[PDB]
């Protein structure tokens, strides 16, 4: 039972926060590059139910556009796309 990463597509404007959800050590990946881990602009917050996790990009930049996923250690999730439109 690998984790689930959503939304499959998230489009935000530069300046706002891009928040994903990983449901299931938990690692946030963007080959894979580790962004954050549970327990900078990439923060991971556990939800009250304990099984869901908010993975937010505080003040998303244009170059943050790409594919993201989360993995539990190494079972990985599907890849979600983030788009950051110019302002």
């Amino acid at each position, epitope marked *: 039972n*690998p984790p689930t990463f*959503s*939304p*499959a*597509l998230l489009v935000v404007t530069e300046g706002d926060n891009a928040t994903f959800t990983c449901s299931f050590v938990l690692n946030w990946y963007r080959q894979t590059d580790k962004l954050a881990a549970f327990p900078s602009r990439f923060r991971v917050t556990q939800l009250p139910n304990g099984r869901d996790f908010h993975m937010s990009v505080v003040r998303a930049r244009r170059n943050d556009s790409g594919t993201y996923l989360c993995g539990a250690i190494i*079972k990985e999730s*599907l890849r979600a796309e983030l*788009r950051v439109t110019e302002r």
Partner: antibody
Amino acid sequence: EVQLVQSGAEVKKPGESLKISCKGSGYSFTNFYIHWVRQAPGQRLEWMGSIYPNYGDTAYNQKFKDRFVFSLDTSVSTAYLQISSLKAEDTAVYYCARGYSYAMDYWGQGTTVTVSS
Amino acid sequence: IQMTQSPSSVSASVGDRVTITCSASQDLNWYQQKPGKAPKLLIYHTSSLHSGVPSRFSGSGSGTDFTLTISSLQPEDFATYYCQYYLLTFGGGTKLEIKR
């Protein structure tokens, strides 16, 4: 828990119109793509296209461009496949599938479409 | 962007190891479909097993060649298998039948 239920079988005439429904349950419908796949009788699977419940992102196989249209209903969590100017070559089994931009991880049970005079 | 799924059909017995190949001309997903039923996702990202897929299913990929392997065949594994790459495109399909 993740279920995609499609509408019943469709028996139409050449030149009519139909709209297959695809209601998703057990997940946030607005967070995942909806893909559409066609399988002619005894043939292989062929990807028709996909549509996302937000931002208006749609992708179409070039064979099913202007005659096949995808629609969505976010507040009710239902996907739609409408086909106009129906032809006899459209007789196939049409699947809707939840997934991402590149994969289909949960499939509907399918809808058999028969078009004949 | 031209993939070829081989072979068209495989005959094997319960307990055998079966390898299905999809080769390109210049990641891959694998699906399983039984007669009259909807397909199921088996492998994503070339080698990651989907939720609920038994560990006897495994995938690998080296450049232009990708293989789906079923280590020990069970009675439930006889079906048709499709590889899919990404516009999404399915392979030709491989029917796995019972040998006798």
